[PDB]
């Protein structure tokens, strides 16, 4: 039972190494990146219209740092007047 | 009281006995 408790503590930590099959990247997997020779650039410029706002709120919640404040302005050079 | 409630048989070592009380049928090839 001591080894059973040790197994419960460790669980399946070192068995996640094989589960890295999703890390592999292949060009042919994406359906629309290949339909035209320049479809890669078309898809790369298709998401520039989208931003963080267009993301789903639950996926926005997944972006956790490992809100703007009114008194931090962005610098200018010509000003106004 | 959650600290004392969580202390039970599986933490004490009766985990194998607890799993033995759980019966389920699988579609094993072997």
């Amino acid at each position: 039972r001591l080894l059973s408790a040790l197994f419960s503590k460790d669980n399946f930590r070192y068995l996640m190494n094989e589960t890295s099959d999703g890390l592999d990247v292949n060009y042919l997997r994406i359906p629309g990146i290949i339909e035209n020779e320049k479809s890669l650039g078309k898809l790369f410029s298709s998401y520039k219209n989208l931003a963080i706002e267009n993301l789903h709120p639950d996926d926005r919640l997944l972006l956790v740092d490992p809100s703007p404040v009114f008194f931090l302005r962005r610098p200018q050079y010509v000003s106004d007047g | 009281k959650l600290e004392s409630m969580v202390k039970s048989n599986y933490r004490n070592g009766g985990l194998d006995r607890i799993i033995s009380k759980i019966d389920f049928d699988f579609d094993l090839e072997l």
Partner: protein, 502 residues
């Protein structure tokens, strides 16, 4: 709120990226002129007839490579290779520039990579074929960034991480919008155990493209697992299943493992533990109805069947996993560990110790195998060998939080006697780890600490004995009460000593 699915990011994108990108019908103009032919890929498309028709009509190479991509989606790797080879034999590519031939060579490189991924065998041969195709593509057209991406992936597979990182640095200098470069860089950093940097790269890839294959959310869940925020990992995995409900059983496997971890470490009562464990078993069985030969699922089920005293079926599954997945050393180590655990009931101490040694040699990260090896050394009455092995393991792994190892070291040092200070240190560390893990502290450690402190500090020994008595409650024995009475007698606490003696 808005539903989180593939249709959400479809509706976010324009209809050009909705309908055109997922067309299963290919339009092929004929050599006679304005005549075209539409072939639906839902039906059983023959590779040879389609290639002959395309060669006869001399269609644009985009149609050939699109058909190759669809046959890749169909799994027809040999058919896609035939398409690429006959495309190289077609008149259009021969009369085109070297850029088209380089693109088709890179497609053949990706075909070799996909065959290697789908088979996990013949690595050297497919790697050499892919390297030759990529070298031909680079010689014909060195200006294509896809050749650099392929070079980086080739370096990553051959564990040439530095050169691949240099290639991805060059690609980032060229443009920062390359999603594949970010994914490859994150894969390399994860391989180099740089989890946080890969986590920022995964977040950047998710923000740039939520519909990119491979799924970044798998890596985000892995990083959350490394940062203990497994709840967000499970949430992201559920979102990934919503986006990718097909051919993504690995996400279900990770969800099942996370559920098992939550059941092990969070169940507040026996009934809740039983309910959660049965739910995890039912979910695992439901995942098994799609794939019944996945070795990791058999390895996970082996633990449950070992707990069910079904050692024979555990042996059968372990031998099957060893026969199939002998390439993966982790499965060999796990199977050897389970065989040693089975033989422990049979008390085959030599055989179990040998199996533990083989498991250690297969995968050094299996701490449980080494602890079982030490237990088998204790079983064969090899006290000195077990002590030397435990000291070696502790000095090599001073940062490891193996509480039971430190408890065993404290007990062994108390038996030795001369190493009492090391016993005090290890038992205090065991107590601290158990308190941090909210696990029931064994009173035997307190008894050993009191015995050691008898010659050093009677106050600390009495305090530890009182803590052990409070932990035991009604399980107090005659020896504990007698030692408490003697402690109070030496403390001149006549009343308390008399009560303890009574």
């Amino acid at each position: 709120m808005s539903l989180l699915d593939q249709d959400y990011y479809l509706s976010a994108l324009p209809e050009d990226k909705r309908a055109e990108l997922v067309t299963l019908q290919l339009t092929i103009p004929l050599k006679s002129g304005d005549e075209v032919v539409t072939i639906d890929f839902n039906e059983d498309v023959d590779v040879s007839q389609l290639c002959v028709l395309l060669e006869s009509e001399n269609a644009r190479p985009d149609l050939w490579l699109s058909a190759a991509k669809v046959f890749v989606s169909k799994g027809n790797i040999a058919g896609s290779q035939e398409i690429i080879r006959k495309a190289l034999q077609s008149n259009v590519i021969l009369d085109s520039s070297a850029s088209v031939t380089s693109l088709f060579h890179n497609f053949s490189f990706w075909l070799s990579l996909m065959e290697y991924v789908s088979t996990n065998s013949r690595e050297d041969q497919f790697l050499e074929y892919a390297s030759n195709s990529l070298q031909a593509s680079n010689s014909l057209d060195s200006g294509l960034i896809l050749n650099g991406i392929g070079n980086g992936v080739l370096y990553a597979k051959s564990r040439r991480y530095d050169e691949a990182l240099k290639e991805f640095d060059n690609l980032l200098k060229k443009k920062s919008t390359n999603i594949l470069a970010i994914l490859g860089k994150a894969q390399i950093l994860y391989k180099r155990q740089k989890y946080s940097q890969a986590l920022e790269l995964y977040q950047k890839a998710l923000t740039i493209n939520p519909l990119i294959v491979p799924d970044p959310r798998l890596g985000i869940g892995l990083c959350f697992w490394h940062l203990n925020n497994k709840q967000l990992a499970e949430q992201a995995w559920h979102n990934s299943l919503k986006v990718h409900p097909q051919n993504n059983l690995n996400t279900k496997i990770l969800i099942c493992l996370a559920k098992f971890d939550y059941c092990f470490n969070e169940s507040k009562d026996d009934d809740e533990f039983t309910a959660l464990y049965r739910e995890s078993l039912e979910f695992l069985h439901s995942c098994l109805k799609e794939d019944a030969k996945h070795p990791l699922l058999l390895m996970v089920l082996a633990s449950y069947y070992f707990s069910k005293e079904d050692y024979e079926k555990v042996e059968k599954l372990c031998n099957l996993v060893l026969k199939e997945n002998s390439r993966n050393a982790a499965f060999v180590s796990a199977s050897h560990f389970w065989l040693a655990r089975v033989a422990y009931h049979k008390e085959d101490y030599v055989q179990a110790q040998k199996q533990f040694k083989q498991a250690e040699d297969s995968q050094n990260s299996n701490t449980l195998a080494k602890l079982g090896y030490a237990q088998c050394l204790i079983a064969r009455n090899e006290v000195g060998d077990a002590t030397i092995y435990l000291e070696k393991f502790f000095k090599e792994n001073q940062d490891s939080k193996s509480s039971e190892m430190m408890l065993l070291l404290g007990i062994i040092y108390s038996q030795s006697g001369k190493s009492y200070y090391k016993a005090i240190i290890f038992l205090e560390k065991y107590v601290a780890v158990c308190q941090e893990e909210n696990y029931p502290i064994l009173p035997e450690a307190y008894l050993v600490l009191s015995r050691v402190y008898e010659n050093k500090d009677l106050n600390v020994a009495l305090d530890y004995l009182m803590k052990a008595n409070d932990i035991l409650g009604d399980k107090a024995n005659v020896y504990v009460l007698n030692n408490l009475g003697i402690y109070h007698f030496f403390r001149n606490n006549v009343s308390q000593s008399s009560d303890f003696f009574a």
